[PDB]
DNA sequence: GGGTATTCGCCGCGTACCTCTCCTAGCCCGCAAGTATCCTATTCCTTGCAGCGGT
């Protein structure tokens, strides 16, 4: 059902799309992953230590 | 006495850092504050003794 829904999007079903570099300007081969995270900021500041 | 087994009691169990809270109990005696009470006046009445005109 993931591959179906990512169908239903336009998105590669493969779930790994091409990128660039940004310096470079020339492409990564090996076709890389990229999708949307859910991440937490933890209470562990740096100015705290 | 003596070689042995069994029990008792002491010794020991990682490093560094960050955050938070809490730290004696009970009696006693001076003492401030607040209060109910006691003495202090005024107005009426009916006595008891000293002056006092009068003769």
Not at 15 to 23: A, K, P, T, V
Not at 35 to 47: P, Q, R, W
Request: glycine share 10%; hydrophobic share 35%.
């Amino acid at each position: 059902e993931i591959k179906e829904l990512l169908k239903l999007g336009d998105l590669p079903t493969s779930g790994q799309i091409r990128l660039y570099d940004g310096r470079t300007g020339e492409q990564f081969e090996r076709p890389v992953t990229v999708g949307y995270m859910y991440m937490l900021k933890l209470n562990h500041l740096v100015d705290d230590k």
